[PDB]
Ligand binder design. Sequence first.
Ligand SMILES: O=S(=O)(O)c1ccc(-c2ccccc2)cc1
Ligand SMILES: O=S(=O)(O)c1ccc(-c2ccccc2)cc1
Ligand SMILES: O=S(=O)(O)c1ccc(-c2ccccc2)cc1
Ligand SMILES: O=S(=O)(O)c1ccc(-c2ccccc2)cc1
Ligand SMILES: O=S(=O)(O)c1ccc(-c2ccccc2)cc1
Ligand SMILES: O=S(=O)(O)c1ccc(-c2ccccc2)cc1
Ligand SMILES: O=S(=O)(O)c1ccc(-c2ccccc2)cc1
Ligand SMILES: O=S(=O)(O)c1ccc(-c2ccccc2)cc1
Lengths: 733, 402, 402
Amino acid sequence: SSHHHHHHSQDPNSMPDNTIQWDKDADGIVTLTMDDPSGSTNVMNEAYIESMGKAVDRLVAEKDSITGVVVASAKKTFFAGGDVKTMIQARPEDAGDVFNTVETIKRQLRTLETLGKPVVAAINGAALGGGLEIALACHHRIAADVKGSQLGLPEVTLGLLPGGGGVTRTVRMFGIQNAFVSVLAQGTRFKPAKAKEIGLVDELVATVEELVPAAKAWIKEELKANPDGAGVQPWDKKGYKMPGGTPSSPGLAAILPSFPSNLRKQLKGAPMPAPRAILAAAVEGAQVDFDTASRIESRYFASLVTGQVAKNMMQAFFFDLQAINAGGSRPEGIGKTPIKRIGVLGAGMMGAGIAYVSAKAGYEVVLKDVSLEAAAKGKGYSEKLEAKALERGRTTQERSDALLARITPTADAADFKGVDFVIEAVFENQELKHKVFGEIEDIVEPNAILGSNTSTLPITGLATGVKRQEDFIGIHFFSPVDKMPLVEIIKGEKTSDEALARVFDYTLAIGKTPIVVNDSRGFFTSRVIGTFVNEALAMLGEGVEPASIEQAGSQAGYPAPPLQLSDELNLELMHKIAVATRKGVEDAGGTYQPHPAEAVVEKMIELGRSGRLKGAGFYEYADGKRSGLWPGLRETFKSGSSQPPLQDMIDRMLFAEALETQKCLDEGVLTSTADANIGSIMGIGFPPWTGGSAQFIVGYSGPAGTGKAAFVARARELAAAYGDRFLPPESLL
Amino acid sequence: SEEAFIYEAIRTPRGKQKNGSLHEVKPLSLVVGLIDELRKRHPDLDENLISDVILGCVSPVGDQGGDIARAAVLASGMPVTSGGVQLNRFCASGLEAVNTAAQKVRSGWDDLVLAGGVESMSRVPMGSDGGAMGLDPATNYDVMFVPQSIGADLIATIEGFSREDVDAYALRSQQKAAEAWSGGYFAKSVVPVRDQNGLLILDHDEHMRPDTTKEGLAKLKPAFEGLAALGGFDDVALQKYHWVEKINHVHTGGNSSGIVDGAALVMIGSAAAGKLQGLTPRARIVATATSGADPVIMLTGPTPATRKVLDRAGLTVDDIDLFELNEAFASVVLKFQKDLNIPDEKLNVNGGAIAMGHPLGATGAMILGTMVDELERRNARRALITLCIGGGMGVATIIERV
Amino acid sequence: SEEAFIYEAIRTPRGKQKNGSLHEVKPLSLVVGLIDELRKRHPDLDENLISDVILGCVSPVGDQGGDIARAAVLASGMPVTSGGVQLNRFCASGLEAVNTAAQKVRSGWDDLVLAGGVESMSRVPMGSDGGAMGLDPATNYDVMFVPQSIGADLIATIEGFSREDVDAYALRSQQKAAEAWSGGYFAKSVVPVRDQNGLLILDHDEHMRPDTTKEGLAKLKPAFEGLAALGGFDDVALQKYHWVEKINHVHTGGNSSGIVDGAALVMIGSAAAGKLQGLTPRARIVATATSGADPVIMLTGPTPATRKVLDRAGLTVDDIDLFELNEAFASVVLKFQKDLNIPDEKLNVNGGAIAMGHPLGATGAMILGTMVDELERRNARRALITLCIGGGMGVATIIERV
Ligand SMILES: O=S(=O)(O)c1ccc(-c2ccccc2)cc1
Ligand SMILES: O=S(=O)(O)c1ccc(-c2ccccc2)cc1
Ligand SMILES: O=S(=O)(O)c1ccc(-c2ccccc2)cc1
Ligand SMILES: O=S(=O)(O)c1ccc(-c2ccccc2)cc1
Ligand SMILES: O=S(=O)(O)c1ccc(-c2ccccc2)cc1
Ligand SMILES: O=S(=O)(O)c1ccc(-c2ccccc2)cc1
Ligand SMILES: O=S(=O)(O)c1ccc(-c2ccccc2)cc1
Ligand SMILES: O=S(=O)(O)c1ccc(-c2ccccc2)cc1
């Protein structure tokens, strides 16, 4: 009933500040302007709830003198998100308070929506999550087509769902299938033009100054032309029919059982509860009236907020990612150094991809290879990506031609004149990189960054081939560069702080997320992803079915199963690394403990199946595409003789990387867990539901318990059953 | 305690789903016609001694809603004390109705019971009733819902049955069904459907294709008519059976059960009830059993249920003269035969649902009466009837000729 | 002579139809909650020994379609061998499930069986499943279809029950339901409904009006919504009961059963099955019976069914300590009390569906468990449970405390 959180006396010093300004024109149109004084963004917090409660109360009390309502904002954005610092603290015992809070939020929006008067949202900037939910409660939405504006319900990306009516209202507007697929399941963000196209927005204006007037103009016309239906949503009219039908409709009842199966297919059986909950709230809500549907929505929301996955994802994709983008790993007291011309050495898949993202961000790129034929095929990588983006309509023919025009393919070292940023992406060989850098370090500018994209070779050693080692640094990209969002910045022993900042600022400019890693063998990404594939190859050697291995990888939440990923990493490079590691150990006076996967690698080398690059690996490769698992794999390794439970296989892969991440944190390879979590998620594909390979430890949840203590118990379980490599470090004990 | 006997077991012919002869016939009328055939065969029977009418029905909605068994009692003018209950255990509903009627007589608290089933799939299609396991995403996402066809393909993939293997069984069913019809085996148990004026509507199983050939079956395309055509279920099945890499879709319309319309009635009673009403026992219910297996593979429920009904009756496979398993999918029968080493000449000896059709709620009582008639014709002694069911269930029954 | 025992009998609270607490709760969830409560009471129960799950359900469509019993077995994660069958015998479905479970145990072919019912009438309204007896004009015209309320009014007319008479019974039911709740009679049997977060949804029977006065009952109008509001049914009834000039419409929403949501579960097994699982038997199923009377007056089936179960168990009225008849309509209980001369202090002693509601498929199993507790709370010996049924049927059960 009440629009407020409390109905009893509290501490007067605990009264939240006021965030909503009230204004009623002589025509009786009330303009609600949201302006939270505690920050630059209107956010759904305790202050908003109390402020909207007072306003909605006043709307009802003054309903005789009020003809319409306009909901506007005073910030650069409209209304963006919720109070994550408070949501991440909701324990399971707080599920009652969580339920009540979202019920109160929706009780306010339901009153606004059923006022008997037109309510218009003047959306001036981003309307994300709770902001769009506020707008969806209005009867008409007007957005200002302005740079940076986004609209959507991205709650699922933090492990939540739109609990302020976003599920219920989008299903009422678009139907179960379209609401779930297009808006809810993936939290897609829409530019205002696309938002109007799908129905999230009804009108557009050029600038923000036209919004409130256009809103009041629409209120004036709606009352004149449609007085019986003014301020009445489609679902509150007799004769409402849900688009696509209700669950009882014969047409939708035919395909409805395939909705959870298609979801399992998309998620590959990963344990991500949020999309399942959105689908349940969506369908269950379409069976009952709006208010009953809204309350079901609140229960699923409280189920997610109090769960562990939402806490993992809020920690990673909100807190950890904000700290990284704020320059947590960027050295302090360093200024800016804009970049004029980028020089990329190598037109392979890596160097061509680096040139594409560099030219897409507006930089002039010189793409050098050994021959002009090769450099030209390197620019063809960008041409094929632009051609596929023109036929889909995501870029103009004008901006595409200007993108390609910034890519100048060459085979001459002299074309690197005026380059202030070098990104070398040639073969993994130290004396080659020493040679390649020596032939350009004099042609490029004196203050040019000398970056090397390497996966294995140490940076400090590579720097002995240039004169200015202060500006030599490792800039590790990930294939395919156009779709992989991390850049691993590797600091050699002579690398300066200024160089760290310039590559840091470069990474943000091209739209990628940086981490800073100290020089070490395998750095962070390569070292940790190695423990992942090696754990799977060991399973193959032990006799586990290859199909079970790949399912375990997919059902753990990885983007690619480990045998498939091994072919792309090339078993010969895996062997070269194992040989390198053994050489350093046996020469320091010690004894090398080989990983059980090294035998499986060598057996595939002997059988002439070193990976995809040479046409045969754990998979058969026909017509350039992948074509099933090699049928001889089962007889080579006696597949089926060992049948461990699937969860053991899943855990062995997750724990191998979590434990290795802790070693990197202990050794100083990484300086912050934020880098470890985002580095594992965005760099090597650690499953997002874990929040990262470091969050996986503190947020672990199994049948034995929760948290670091339960992680250690399970690691000790795996160690006693599969090998001492699963024993936990002292830092966890 | 009280022994339960089969006194009559009759069925309608099975009309086909497309341009079928029974499409104009209300499913209630199919049952009433069988009730009237029983009266014709026993005019002086005191119907007040009939204490219940148990009809299996998988889609109890529409023409089949509102307790169709009670509708059959009232519409046919049967005594109002004869009750009437509908039940749904999916594919075994017909045989579960008979098994429940048999267990009612054993308890001593019922004397004479009509059991059977009705399913007009051309009028009430499978799935019309809805259900949580399919239309509630929380339940669906967790129980790993999969349609029956993909379980059958998965069985063929694991056990190693090829497309030619399952098509070879399909041809065998068509041949044995045509031989049984030509030999007059079904003459006295298939009751022709007639209209209000006595004009003939259907007198044979019109789904049969007796001129089936191996080449014709090889030209058929894998199944794509219902939930199977929709995506996802293959991946969901392999998430459960993670050691299987690829599912071999070998099942088509020619080696799967046919969608048909039909009904069946069985009269079950104690020795005293038959002696009082002048009825001759045709067979005796020796034992019934229920078990199950994994709900994703789903269709492998018959093997444990048969093993439990044999153990319960103190018998072995060698003591059974006729095996009757419902031909939902060819791979289900081939798996049942392989696992128990059933001899080919004892398995579905008069054809099955691939040739004649599988009218869900009525099938169990049709294939039961089929065995009562074949034991008498062969002068054999024991027969075992079982059906796989959706969700992973299973029902088996042993009858002995009397 | 395998004897059948009741080991557990539980039920949800009953949520009302208008703005009910259970309207957001799927009926499948109502059954699963009661399965989880049985686990809480017997955490070391070998669920593999549970051989069937029989649920009564009168409108098996939508949320209640697709063999909801099987859905409860899979959604609760019970063994796939536990089966699951839905049945529909109208209002008696819940008790017919329990009686069928008893008869299966007596036969010796089932050891431990779950039985009960579920009906979410606010989500799946009565009549949702269609049906020939109501929707096919040929059959409707012949069986003289009439809604139950009109049969109830006719019973009041023929027997001479005034409007004040049925209102006096309605008041008594409200008073005895309030006394039973206040006295804690239902504390251990009514299992509160909670959401996925553990938050409370319902812990009491919302339909009760414990402040009911005989003056407020008199202010109510005979205002049934649905078929009774449409025309013709009065004339159809009097064409059969032709010695009656006019039907006195005495029944209202205050002296007729409530439309509510609810579920009930009963665990039934043999002595050996219970002893093998550390279970204490609470009551013994002494006898069950079915009969019926004319379907136009409809709700007179209880008297021959109660008569039949008494003669079957070798007992009379004076041998029975408690009589529990479902309060579908006040006149039915008064007719039943008059015919058998049931003492007032033995009849529906804890109130009935007029106060607490009548969740069709489940009611027979709720009032069954209600008498199990009241026999134990009074240390009484025998109880007789019976329900009238739509279409003129009747089911009765006699239990004995152990
Ligand atoms: O007792 S009152 O002064 O009326 C009072 C009432 C409520 C509040 C309050 C509201 C929202 C969040 C925190 C505190 C504070 C004071
Ligand atoms: O999921 S949202 O609807 O975006 C949502 C986000 C945030 C909140 C909230 C958090 C803390 C204190 C009060 C409210 C509520 C709902
Ligand atoms: O019990 S508290 O920890 O004070 C707590 C209570 C409520 C919430 C919350 C509210 C709305 C949306 C999400 C979370 C978070 C924390
Ligand atoms: O400089 S070496 O010592 O030759 C050396 C350098 C790097 C590695 C390594 C690479 C990828 C993952 C883990 C380790 C191993 C040895
Ligand atoms: O960064 S990558 O080039 O993708 C790369 C990453 C890791 C490895 C690797 C390291 C140790 C053992 C096996 C393989 C090899 C290559
Ligand atoms: O959605 S993002 O966080 O931008 C994201 C994008 C991509 C990846 C990824 C994909 C394949 C292999 C490894 C990682 C991970 C996260
Ligand atoms: O026989 S059907 O009604 O077609 C039927 C089909 C499928 C299922 C089912 C399958 C897997 C998990 C749960 C239920 C149950 C019944
Ligand atoms: O219990 S009901 O489903 O409401 C139901 C109502 C009415 C009838 C019926 C009435 C008269 C002649 C035949 C059937 C049967 C059932």
